[PDB]
Short mmCIF file of C-alpha atoms in Angstrom, two decimals:
data_model
loop_
_atom_site.label_atom_id
_atom_site.label_comp_id
_atom_site.label_asym_id
_atom_site.label_seq_id
_atom_site.Cartn_x
_atom_site.Cartn_y
_atom_site.Cartn_z
CA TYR A 11 0.00 0.00 0.00
CA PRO A 12 1.59 3.11 -1.40
CA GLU A 13 4.38 4.78 0.55
CA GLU A 14 6.88 6.27 -1.91
CA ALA A 15 7.58 8.75 -4.73
CA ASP A 16 8.68 6.05 -7.19
CA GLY A 17 8.62 8.16 -10.38
CA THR A 18 6.34 10.26 -12.55
CA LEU A 19 5.47 11.02 -16.19
CA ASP A 20 6.89 13.90 -18.23
CA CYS A 21 5.45 12.65 -21.52
CA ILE A 22 2.59 14.93 -22.67
CA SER A 23 1.55 18.05 -20.78
CA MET A 24 -1.98 19.31 -19.97
CA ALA A 25 -3.41 16.20 -18.33
CA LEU A 26 -6.96 16.42 -17.10
CA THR A 27 -8.53 13.04 -16.20
CA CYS A 28 -8.09 9.28 -16.51
CA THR A 29 -9.47 5.90 -15.44
CA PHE A 30 -8.75 2.20 -15.97
CA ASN A 31 -10.23 -0.99 -17.37
CA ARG A 32 -11.03 -4.10 -15.34
CA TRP A 33 -7.48 -5.40 -15.73
CA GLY A 34 -5.25 -2.37 -15.16
CA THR A 35 -3.00 -2.36 -18.22
CA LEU A 36 -3.36 1.02 -19.95
CA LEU A 37 -3.90 4.64 -18.90
CA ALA A 38 -6.23 6.97 -20.84
CA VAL A 39 -4.80 10.41 -20.08
CA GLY A 40 -7.40 13.05 -20.95
CA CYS A 41 -6.01 16.29 -22.34
CA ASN A 42 -6.98 19.93 -22.76
CA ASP A 43 -6.62 20.17 -26.56
CA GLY A 44 -8.88 17.17 -27.24
CA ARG A 45 -6.49 14.24 -26.89
CA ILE A 46 -6.43 10.87 -25.13
CA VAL A 47 -2.86 9.71 -24.47
CA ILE A 48 -2.65 5.97 -23.78
CA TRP A 49 0.33 4.77 -21.75
CA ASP A 50 1.33 1.26 -20.63
CA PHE A 51 2.56 0.05 -17.23
CA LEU A 52 4.45 -3.21 -17.72
CA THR A 53 6.21 -1.95 -20.86
CA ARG A 54 6.21 1.78 -19.90
CA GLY A 55 5.35 2.85 -23.44
CA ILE A 56 2.82 4.96 -25.32
CA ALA A 57 1.00 2.73 -27.79
CA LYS A 58 -1.73 4.88 -29.37
CA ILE A 59 -2.23 8.65 -29.43
CA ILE A 60 -5.84 9.44 -30.36
CA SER A 61 -6.00 13.13 -31.31
CA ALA A 62 -9.73 13.23 -30.67
CA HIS A 63 -10.80 16.88 -30.63
CA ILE A 64 -9.57 20.41 -29.89
CA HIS A 65 -11.76 21.13 -26.81
CA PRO A 66 -11.27 20.13 -23.11
CA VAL A 67 -12.16 16.44 -22.76
CA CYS A 68 -13.95 16.32 -19.40
CA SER A 69 -15.23 12.79 -18.71
CA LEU A 70 -14.04 9.30 -19.65
CA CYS A 71 -15.24 5.74 -19.03
CA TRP A 72 -13.93 2.31 -20.06
CA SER A 73 -16.27 -0.59 -20.77
CA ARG A 74 -15.97 -4.26 -19.83
CA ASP A 75 -15.22 -5.68 -23.31
CA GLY A 76 -11.98 -3.73 -23.62
CA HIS A 77 -13.02 -1.92 -26.79
CA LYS A 78 -15.36 1.02 -26.08
CA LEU A 79 -14.47 4.29 -24.37
CA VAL A 80 -16.94 7.18 -24.11
CA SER A 81 -16.16 10.86 -23.61
CA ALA A 82 -17.47 14.41 -23.95
CA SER A 83 -16.05 17.92 -24.03
CA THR A 84 -16.96 21.55 -24.48
CA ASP A 85 -17.09 20.23 -28.02
CA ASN A 86 -20.25 18.74 -26.42
CA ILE A 87 -20.02 15.57 -28.50
CA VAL A 88 -20.66 12.23 -26.82
CA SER A 89 -17.82 10.48 -28.63
CA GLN A 90 -16.56 6.86 -28.65
CA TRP A 91 -13.28 5.23 -29.66
CA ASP A 92 -11.54 1.89 -30.07
CA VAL A 93 -7.94 1.14 -29.14
CA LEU A 94 -7.03 -0.91 -32.23
CA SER A 95 -6.50 2.01 -34.62
CA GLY A 96 -8.47 4.95 -33.20
CA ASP A 97 -11.89 4.32 -34.74
CA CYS A 98 -14.45 6.98 -33.83
CA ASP A 99 -17.56 4.85 -34.33
CA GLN A 100 -20.22 7.33 -33.18
CA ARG A 101 -20.55 11.09 -32.77
CA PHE A 102 -23.39 12.70 -30.81
CA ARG A 103 -23.27 16.49 -31.11
CA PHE A 104 -25.52 17.43 -28.17
CA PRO A 105 -26.36 20.55 -26.11
CA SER A 106 -26.06 21.01 -22.29
CA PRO A 107 -22.38 20.25 -21.45
CA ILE A 108 -21.39 17.07 -19.71
CA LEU A 109 -19.78 16.15 -16.38
CA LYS A 110 -19.68 12.34 -16.16
CA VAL A 111 -20.33 9.31 -18.36
CA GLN A 112 -20.93 5.80 -16.99
CA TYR A 113 -21.75 2.44 -18.57
CA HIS A 114 -23.89 -0.33 -17.34
CA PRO A 115 -21.18 -2.90 -16.45
CA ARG A 116 -22.39 -5.78 -18.65
CA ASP A 117 -25.29 -4.38 -20.72
CA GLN A 118 -22.86 -2.00 -22.43
CA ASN A 119 -25.42 -0.71 -24.93
CA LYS A 120 -26.64 1.54 -22.09
CA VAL A 121 -24.52 4.48 -20.89
CA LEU A 122 -25.45 7.04 -18.23
CA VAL A 123 -24.62 10.69 -18.89
CA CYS A 124 -24.75 13.69 -16.54
CA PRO A 125 -25.68 17.01 -18.24
CA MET A 126 -24.97 20.50 -16.92
CA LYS A 127 -28.39 21.57 -15.63
CA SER A 128 -31.19 19.02 -15.79
CA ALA A 129 -31.46 15.38 -14.74
CA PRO A 130 -29.13 12.60 -15.93
CA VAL A 131 -30.97 10.74 -18.67
CA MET A 132 -29.83 7.28 -19.76
CA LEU A 133 -28.44 7.41 -23.27
CA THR A 134 -27.77 4.41 -25.51
CA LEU A 135 -25.32 3.62 -28.32
CA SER A 136 -27.40 3.08 -31.47
CA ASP A 137 -30.79 4.72 -30.98
CA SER A 138 -31.63 8.14 -29.59
CA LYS A 139 -34.22 6.59 -27.23
CA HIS A 140 -32.96 8.28 -24.09
CA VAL A 141 -34.79 7.03 -20.99
CA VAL A 142 -35.96 9.96 -18.85
CA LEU A 143 -35.11 9.47 -15.19
CA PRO A 144 -37.79 11.43 -13.29
CA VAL A 145 -36.40 13.87 -10.73
CA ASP A 146 -39.22 15.51 -8.78
CA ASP A 147 -37.87 18.84 -7.56
CA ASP A 148 -35.80 19.96 -10.61
CA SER A 149 -34.91 23.34 -9.01
CA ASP A 150 -31.44 22.23 -7.87
CA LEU A 151 -29.80 22.40 -11.34
CA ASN A 152 -26.96 20.00 -10.36
CA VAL A 153 -28.14 16.42 -9.82
CA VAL A 154 -25.76 13.45 -10.03
CA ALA A 155 -26.65 9.78 -10.44
CA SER A 156 -25.08 6.36 -10.97
CA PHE A 157 -25.58 2.60 -10.99
CA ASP A 158 -24.69 0.17 -8.23
CA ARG A 159 -21.82 -2.31 -8.65
CA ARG A 160 -23.64 -4.95 -10.72
CA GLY A 161 -25.83 -2.47 -12.59
CA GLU A 162 -28.83 -3.75 -10.63
CA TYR A 163 -30.16 -0.33 -9.60
CA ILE A 164 -29.83 3.40 -10.22
CA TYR A 165 -28.78 5.64 -7.33
CA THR A 166 -29.36 9.40 -7.57
CA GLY A 167 -28.38 12.55 -5.72
CA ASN A 168 -29.73 16.11 -5.76
CA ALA A 169 -28.36 19.34 -4.32
CA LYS A 170 -30.97 19.61 -1.55
CA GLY A 171 -30.10 16.31 0.12
CA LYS A 172 -32.85 13.91 -0.90
CA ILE A 173 -31.70 10.57 -2.32
CA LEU A 174 -33.84 8.49 -4.67
CA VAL A 175 -33.23 4.99 -6.03
CA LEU A 176 -34.68 3.63 -9.28
CA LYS A 177 -34.53 0.31 -11.10
CA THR A 178 -31.86 0.12 -13.82
CA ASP A 179 -34.29 0.44 -16.76
CA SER A 180 -37.93 0.58 -15.56
CA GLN A 181 -37.41 3.09 -12.70
CA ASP A 182 -38.98 1.58 -9.58
CA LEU A 183 -39.09 4.16 -6.77
CA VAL A 184 -37.82 1.94 -3.96
CA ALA A 185 -35.75 4.16 -1.65
CA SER A 186 -36.11 7.72 -0.43
CA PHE A 187 -34.11 9.55 2.24
CA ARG A 188 -32.72 13.00 2.93
CA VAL A 189 -29.18 13.13 4.30
CA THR A 190 -28.58 14.10 7.95
CA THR A 191 -26.27 17.03 7.27
CA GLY A 192 -26.02 19.46 10.21
CA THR A 193 -29.29 20.20 11.97
CA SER A 194 -31.03 22.98 10.00
CA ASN A 195 -28.79 23.22 6.91
CA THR A 196 -28.28 20.29 4.55
CA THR A 197 -25.73 20.14 1.73
CA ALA A 198 -25.25 19.02 -1.86
CA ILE A 199 -23.52 15.97 -3.35
CA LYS A 200 -20.50 16.02 -5.66
CA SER A 201 -19.77 12.32 -6.34
CA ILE A 202 -20.80 8.79 -5.35
CA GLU A 203 -18.39 5.93 -6.05
CA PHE A 204 -18.55 2.15 -5.90
CA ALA A 205 -16.27 -0.81 -5.31
CA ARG A 206 -15.46 -4.03 -7.17
CA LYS A 207 -16.55 -6.41 -4.39
CA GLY A 208 -19.48 -5.57 -2.14
CA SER A 209 -22.04 -2.79 -2.18
CA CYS A 210 -20.53 -0.24 0.17
CA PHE A 211 -20.43 3.30 -1.19
CA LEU A 212 -19.40 6.81 -0.20
CA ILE A 213 -21.34 10.08 -0.20
CA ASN A 214 -19.06 12.99 -1.13
CA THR A 215 -20.96 15.79 0.57
CA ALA A 216 -20.02 19.49 0.63
CA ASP A 217 -19.67 20.28 4.34
CA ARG A 218 -16.18 18.67 4.20
CA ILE A 219 -17.53 15.34 5.49
CA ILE A 220 -17.46 12.02 3.64
CA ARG A 221 -20.26 9.63 4.61
CA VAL A 222 -20.22 5.89 3.88
CA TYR A 223 -23.25 3.63 3.37
CA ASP A 224 -23.99 0.04 2.36
CA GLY A 225 -26.47 -1.16 -0.24
CA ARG A 226 -28.17 -3.80 1.90
CA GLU A 227 -28.70 -1.27 4.70
CA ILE A 228 -30.50 1.22 2.47
CA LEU A 229 -32.49 -1.53 0.74
CA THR A 230 -33.63 -2.50 4.23
CA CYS A 231 -34.36 1.19 4.86
CA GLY A 232 -36.08 1.71 1.52
CA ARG A 233 -38.82 4.30 1.17
CA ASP A 234 -38.77 6.95 3.95
CA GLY A 235 -35.72 5.69 5.79
CA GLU A 236 -33.10 7.30 8.03
CA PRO A 237 -29.93 5.33 7.22
CA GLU A 238 -27.16 5.94 9.69
CA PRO A 239 -23.65 5.94 8.19
CA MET A 240 -21.14 3.16 8.55
CA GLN A 241 -18.39 5.75 8.93
CA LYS A 242 -17.94 9.53 9.13
CA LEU A 243 -14.66 10.88 7.76
CA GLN A 244 -13.17 14.40 7.84
CA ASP A 245 -10.00 16.27 8.83
CA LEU A 246 -10.61 18.89 11.52
CA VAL A 247 -7.01 20.07 11.84
CA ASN A 248 -6.30 21.24 8.34
CA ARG A 249 -9.96 22.19 7.52
CA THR A 250 -9.92 20.73 4.03
CA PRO A 251 -12.60 20.55 1.31
CA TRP A 252 -12.71 17.55 -0.98
CA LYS A 253 -12.41 17.12 -4.74
CA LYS A 254 -12.57 13.45 -5.77
CA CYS A 255 -12.96 10.19 -3.86
CA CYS A 256 -12.63 6.52 -4.82
CA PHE A 257 -12.17 3.04 -3.32
CA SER A 258 -9.46 0.41 -2.97
CA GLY A 259 -9.17 -2.83 -4.91
CA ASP A 260 -11.24 -4.61 -2.29
CA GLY A 261 -13.32 -1.76 -0.91
CA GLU A 262 -11.31 -1.32 2.26
CA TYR A 263 -8.98 1.66 1.81
CA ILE A 264 -10.73 4.90 0.91
CA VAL A 265 -8.49 7.21 -1.12
CA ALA A 266 -9.79 10.79 -1.06
CA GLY A 267 -7.78 13.58 -2.67
CA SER A 268 -7.67 17.15 -1.44
CA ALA A 269 -8.71 20.31 -3.27
CA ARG A 270 -6.25 22.80 -1.77
CA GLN A 271 -2.89 21.27 -0.98
CA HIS A 272 -1.81 18.39 -3.34
CA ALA A 273 -2.04 15.61 -0.77
CA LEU A 274 -3.68 12.19 -0.52
CA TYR A 275 -5.35 10.81 2.58
CA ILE A 276 -6.00 7.08 3.03
CA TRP A 277 -8.41 5.56 5.55
CA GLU A 278 -9.71 2.10 6.42
CA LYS A 279 -13.29 0.98 5.88
CA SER A 280 -13.43 -1.10 9.06
CA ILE A 281 -11.65 0.92 11.75
CA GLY A 282 -11.86 4.36 10.17
CA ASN A 283 -8.54 5.98 11.08
CA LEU A 284 -6.03 7.72 8.87
CA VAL A 285 -3.12 5.45 7.98
CA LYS A 286 -0.79 7.59 5.84
CA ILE A 287 -0.70 11.04 4.25
CA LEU A 288 0.97 11.14 0.85
CA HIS A 289 2.79 14.13 -0.61
CA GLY A 290 4.34 15.38 -3.82
CA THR A 291 5.26 18.71 -5.39
CA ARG A 292 4.03 21.26 -2.85
CA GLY A 293 3.30 23.90 -5.52
CA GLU A 294 0.47 22.23 -7.44
CA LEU A 295 -3.31 21.93 -7.25
CA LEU A 296 -4.67 18.41 -7.67
CA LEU A 297 -7.69 17.46 -9.78
CA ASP A 298 -7.98 13.74 -10.52
CA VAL A 299 -6.87 10.65 -8.59
CA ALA A 300 -6.81 7.16 -10.11
CA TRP A 301 -6.75 3.91 -8.15
CA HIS A 302 -5.45 0.67 -9.67
CA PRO A 303 -7.69 -2.35 -9.02
CA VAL A 304 -5.39 -5.38 -8.65
CA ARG A 305 -2.17 -3.74 -7.49
CA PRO A 306 -2.26 -0.71 -5.17
CA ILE A 307 -0.53 2.09 -7.09
CA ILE A 308 -2.08 5.57 -7.38
CA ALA A 309 -2.05 8.18 -10.15
CA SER A 310 -2.28 11.91 -9.38
CA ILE A 311 -3.18 14.47 -12.06
CA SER A 312 -2.08 18.07 -11.52
CA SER A 313 -0.39 20.59 -13.86
CA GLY A 314 -0.10 17.93 -16.57
CA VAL A 315 2.05 15.75 -14.30
CA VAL A 316 0.96 12.17 -13.55
CA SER A 317 2.83 10.30 -10.83
CA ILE A 318 3.34 6.61 -10.02
CA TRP A 319 3.26 5.82 -6.29
CA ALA A 320 4.38 2.30 -5.32
CA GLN A 321 6.04 0.89 -2.20
CA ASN A 322 9.20 -0.64 -3.82
CA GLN A 323 9.07 -3.95 -1.82
CA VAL A 324 11.66 -2.71 0.68
CA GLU A 325 11.08 -5.81 2.86
CA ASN A 326 12.83 -7.90 0.19
CA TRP A 327 12.15 -10.24 -2.69
CA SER A 328 11.99 -13.72 -1.16
CA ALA A 329 11.71 -15.76 -4.39
CA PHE A 330 14.77 -17.93 -3.77
CA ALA A 331 14.88 -18.61 -0.01
CA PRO A 332 11.89 -19.76 1.96
CA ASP A 333 14.70 -21.88 3.45
CA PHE A 334 18.08 -20.73 4.86
CA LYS A 335 17.18 -19.06 8.13
CA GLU A 336 19.80 -16.95 9.86
CA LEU A 337 21.79 -17.77 13.00
CA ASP A 338 23.22 -14.64 14.61
CA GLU A 339 25.98 -16.02 16.81
CA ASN A 340 28.01 -18.90 15.45
CA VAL A 341 25.71 -21.75 16.47
CA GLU A 342 27.33 -25.16 16.03
CA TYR A 343 25.63 -28.57 16.01
CA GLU A 344 28.62 -30.59 14.81
CA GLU A 345 28.04 -33.67 16.98
CA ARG A 346 26.10 -35.51 14.26
CA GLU A 347 28.02 -37.89 12.01
CA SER A 348 25.57 -39.48 9.55
CA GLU A 349 3.67 -42.34 -4.92
CA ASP A 350 0.94 -41.27 -2.50
CA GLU A 351 -1.53 -39.16 -4.52
CA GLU A 352 -2.85 -38.94 -8.09
CA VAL A 353 -4.15 -35.48 -9.04
CA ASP A 354 -5.12 -34.65 -12.64
CA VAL A 355 -1.93 -33.12 -14.03
CA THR A 356 -3.75 -32.79 -17.38
CA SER A 357 -6.49 -30.65 -15.82
CA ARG B 14 59.41 -46.85 27.08
CA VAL B 15 56.51 -47.65 24.73
CA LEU B 16 54.19 -44.68 25.32
CA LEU B 17 52.45 -41.86 23.43
CA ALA B 18 53.93 -38.80 21.66
CA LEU B 19 54.07 -35.07 22.35
CA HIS B 20 53.11 -33.31 19.10
CA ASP B 21 50.91 -36.18 17.85
CA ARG B 22 47.84 -34.15 18.74
CA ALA B 23 45.27 -31.57 17.72
CA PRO B 24 44.62 -28.63 20.10
CA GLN B 25 41.03 -29.82 20.60
CA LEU B 26 42.41 -33.29 21.42
CA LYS B 27 43.42 -34.01 25.01
CA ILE B 28 46.05 -36.69 25.49
CA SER B 29 45.64 -37.26 29.22
CA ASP B 30 48.33 -36.82 31.85
CA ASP B 31 48.87 -40.56 32.42
CA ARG B 32 49.88 -41.44 28.80
CA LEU B 33 47.54 -44.43 29.12
CA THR B 34 44.16 -42.78 28.37
CA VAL B 35 42.81 -40.39 25.72
CA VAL B 36 39.96 -37.98 26.47
CA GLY B 37 37.38 -37.62 23.72
CA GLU B 38 36.56 -34.46 21.83
CA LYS B 39 32.94 -34.12 20.68
CA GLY B 40 33.91 -33.81 17.01
CA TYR B 41 35.98 -36.29 15.01
CA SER B 42 39.75 -35.82 14.87
CA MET B 43 42.54 -38.39 14.87
CA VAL B 44 44.99 -39.04 17.70
CA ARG B 45 47.67 -41.70 17.23
CA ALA B 46 50.27 -43.52 19.32
CA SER B 47 54.06 -43.39 18.97
CA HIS B 48 55.63 -46.90 18.92
CA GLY B 49 55.05 -49.04 15.84
CA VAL B 50 56.74 -51.57 13.59
CA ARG B 51 57.08 -52.19 9.84
CA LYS B 52 57.30 -55.99 9.39
CA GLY B 53 56.09 -58.87 11.57
CA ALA B 54 53.18 -60.07 13.69
CA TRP B 55 52.67 -57.76 16.66
CA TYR B 56 50.06 -56.90 19.26
CA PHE B 57 48.87 -54.28 21.75
CA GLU B 58 45.65 -53.59 23.65
CA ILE B 59 43.09 -50.79 23.89
CA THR B 60 40.93 -51.26 26.99
CA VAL B 61 37.55 -49.60 26.39
CA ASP B 62 36.41 -48.63 29.89
CA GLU B 63 33.24 -46.52 29.69
CA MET B 64 30.83 -45.60 26.90
CA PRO B 65 27.80 -43.26 26.58
CA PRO B 66 24.62 -44.19 24.69
CA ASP B 67 24.58 -43.86 20.88
CA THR B 68 28.28 -43.31 20.19
CA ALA B 69 30.65 -43.51 17.22
CA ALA B 70 34.33 -44.36 17.76
CA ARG B 71 36.70 -46.18 15.39
CA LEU B 72 39.95 -47.94 16.31
CA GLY B 73 42.75 -49.59 14.36
CA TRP B 74 46.29 -49.47 13.02
CA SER B 75 47.49 -46.47 11.00
CA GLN B 76 50.47 -44.87 9.29
CA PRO B 77 51.72 -41.42 10.40
CA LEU B 78 51.52 -39.72 6.97
CA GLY B 79 47.71 -39.80 7.01
CA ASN B 80 45.24 -37.16 8.12
CA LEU B 81 45.79 -35.65 11.57
CA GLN B 82 42.15 -34.51 11.74
CA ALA B 83 40.07 -37.30 10.21
CA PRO B 84 37.74 -39.85 11.70
CA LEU B 85 39.69 -43.09 11.47
CA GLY B 86 39.18 -45.01 8.23
CA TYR B 87 39.42 -42.01 5.88
CA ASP B 88 42.71 -42.95 4.19
CA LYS B 89 44.40 -45.92 2.54
CA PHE B 90 47.08 -45.69 5.25
CA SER B 91 44.68 -47.10 7.84
CA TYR B 92 41.69 -49.35 8.50
CA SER B 93 38.99 -48.94 11.12
CA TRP B 94 35.93 -50.49 12.74
CA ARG B 95 33.06 -48.49 14.21
CA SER B 96 31.52 -48.78 17.69
CA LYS B 97 28.01 -48.47 16.22
CA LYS B 98 26.61 -50.94 13.64
CA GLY B 99 30.05 -52.58 13.19
CA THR B 100 31.41 -51.40 9.84
CA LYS B 101 34.83 -51.75 8.25
CA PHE B 102 36.01 -48.76 6.25
CA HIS B 103 38.27 -48.24 3.25
CA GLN B 104 38.41 -44.45 2.74
CA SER B 105 35.34 -44.28 5.04
CA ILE B 106 32.77 -46.10 2.88
CA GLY B 107 29.96 -48.15 4.40
CA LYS B 108 30.74 -51.85 4.00
CA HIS B 109 28.87 -53.91 6.58
CA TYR B 110 31.16 -56.03 8.76
CA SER B 111 29.61 -56.86 12.17
CA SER B 112 27.90 -55.13 15.10
CA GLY B 113 30.01 -52.56 16.91
CA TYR B 114 31.60 -52.42 20.34
CA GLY B 115 30.16 -51.20 23.63
CA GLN B 116 31.14 -50.54 27.23
CA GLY B 117 33.57 -52.72 29.17
CA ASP B 118 35.75 -54.50 26.57
CA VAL B 119 39.38 -54.63 25.47
CA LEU B 120 40.08 -53.91 21.79
CA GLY B 121 43.48 -55.56 21.44
CA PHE B 122 44.68 -55.50 17.88
CA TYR B 123 46.70 -57.98 15.82
CA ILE B 124 48.77 -57.24 12.72
CA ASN B 125 50.26 -59.57 10.10
CA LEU B 126 53.07 -58.38 7.82
CA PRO B 127 55.03 -60.64 5.44
CA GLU B 128 57.89 -59.85 3.05
CA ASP B 129 59.85 -61.57 0.26
CA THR B 130 62.67 -63.45 2.00
CA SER B 131 49.28 -58.52 5.12
CA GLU B 132 46.05 -58.22 7.12
CA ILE B 133 44.65 -56.35 10.13
CA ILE B 134 42.65 -58.35 12.70
CA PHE B 135 40.61 -56.80 15.53
CA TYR B 136 39.85 -58.60 18.80
CA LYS B 137 37.02 -57.92 21.24
CA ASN B 138 36.71 -60.04 24.43
CA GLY B 139 39.01 -62.50 22.67
CA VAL B 140 36.55 -62.96 19.78
CA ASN B 141 38.27 -63.26 16.40
CA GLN B 142 36.30 -60.66 14.45
CA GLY B 143 37.72 -61.83 11.12
CA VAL B 144 39.81 -60.11 8.48
CA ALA B 145 39.25 -56.55 7.28
CA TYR B 146 41.33 -56.67 4.07
CA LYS B 147 44.46 -58.26 2.62
CA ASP B 148 47.91 -57.06 1.43
CA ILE B 149 48.24 -53.62 3.02
CA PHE B 150 51.01 -51.18 2.08
CA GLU B 151 54.49 -50.45 3.51
CA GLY B 152 55.27 -48.07 6.35
CA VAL B 153 55.44 -47.60 10.11
CA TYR B 154 52.27 -48.86 11.79
CA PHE B 155 50.92 -46.67 14.60
CA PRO B 156 47.66 -47.26 16.46
CA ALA B 157 44.94 -44.66 15.96
CA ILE B 158 42.01 -43.38 18.04
CA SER B 159 39.13 -41.03 17.22
CA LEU B 160 36.30 -40.61 19.69
CA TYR B 161 32.81 -39.41 20.58
CA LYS B 162 31.94 -37.03 23.47
CA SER B 163 34.39 -37.19 26.37
CA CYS B 164 34.34 -40.91 27.16
CA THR B 165 36.99 -43.19 28.69
CA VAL B 166 39.19 -45.69 26.86
CA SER B 167 42.53 -47.02 28.10
CA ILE B 168 45.59 -48.23 26.19
CA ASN B 169 47.81 -51.16 27.18
CA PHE B 170 51.27 -52.38 26.19
CA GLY B 171 52.43 -54.48 29.15
CA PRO B 172 52.73 -58.27 28.91
CA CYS B 173 50.13 -58.61 31.70
CA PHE B 174 47.29 -58.38 29.19
CA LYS B 175 43.65 -58.48 30.29
CA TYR B 176 42.34 -60.71 27.47
CA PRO B 177 45.22 -62.78 26.02
CA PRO B 178 43.90 -65.07 23.27
CA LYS B 179 45.24 -68.54 22.53
CA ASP B 180 44.75 -68.68 18.75
CA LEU B 181 47.85 -66.91 17.36
CA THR B 182 51.52 -66.49 18.26
CA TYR B 183 51.86 -62.76 18.88
CA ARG B 184 54.33 -60.46 20.62
CA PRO B 185 53.82 -57.36 22.78
CA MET B 186 54.98 -53.97 21.53
CA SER B 187 56.77 -53.24 24.83
CA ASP B 188 59.79 -55.30 23.66
CA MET B 189 60.94 -52.16 21.78
#
């Protein structure tokens, strides 16, 4: 779990956002002049440079099949690409600029797109049959929504504080609760993220407090519930507001990045204490933080600089010697003078 | 007088202050005697007094140009016979001979040495243990001892032997 500086990337400036696939092999660096730089880990090389647009590419999302990205810009085009040769299959010149795109994890014909002002409405790939997700109040002008882990539901979030849950395509109103922010003043939501094992999730509020909930708990709560949080996270010393949160590779180590100071904070899901504060160049302002799913190394995007933060295996490599244990003083023991199992190898 | 030697030792070996007993070192290094012959049929005695459980100690004739530090039986200069599982050794290789020796015996050794005008026989309570090998080389024939943890064996050269056999015509080494 990351503890070092370990190197960085001076390859292409003006980096803005990135994310990963299921496997953690490439790195889709979003750029300001409408580019997606793709860099490799195990070979440390840049395979394909898709010069997509000229406008700031804001959101990105990989799919499960390993073929279909989706993005948008101030070009305001819901684009799509393929990593074989840079094949822009579709091109949706749309109004109302975009913040976040999100697939269904296995029914990858359905993508979920957040506009600027009104409600997120589920787009598709081929047809323009967008499925209207009914938000009641509509006076908040910034409403964010997402799936669960398996794509089995749709979770939403307004700016007042009320949370609604719909079915993934037929929109069953099954859960309704307003968040318990302060006493008389509630707050808005800025992101909600999800793991790769389990249905725990975080609520990135805007009174500098992260709140954590589970899916089974709110499905037990349901309509008109008061779900208490699993965990309440903040930092009262430095008085820090938050920018972007995520999860670990197992949903245990919450990695939330700052919005003032270029620093990472890492918690535990179970206990809930801070474990390590990371640092870097003190004269930057951090925007996007990427977590790697199968091997805990973090990426940090600020000023076009993307950094690789490993832990170097300082303990040692122990590939050769499970044997050969050490004797400190010269211990001597020089008195001494001197077809059971058949497992399918072809399996 | 037929006795032991001064610099026929290792510093971990303890030739005792009677010149009739060697004290064992827990490893395996060779101590040897000082009065030997080159041709003829001769005899001496090693009286094995006391022995621990589960030991390993080898006794026999030897030649002085061997290894000062070996367990006995490592070289072609010398033969040996082990106190556990009774094995004769030629360059210390397992070749099953008998069952080994214990506590309270006398290991009094016979030699046979002809010439144009050769075997090593071990005794134990007068029992003729047989013949180790035949036609050994030429040199001066010292006895040789290597031991276990610090046990007690005695040497003997006087004509008042403890177990004198009546099967061969031998001579004591104290005639020198």
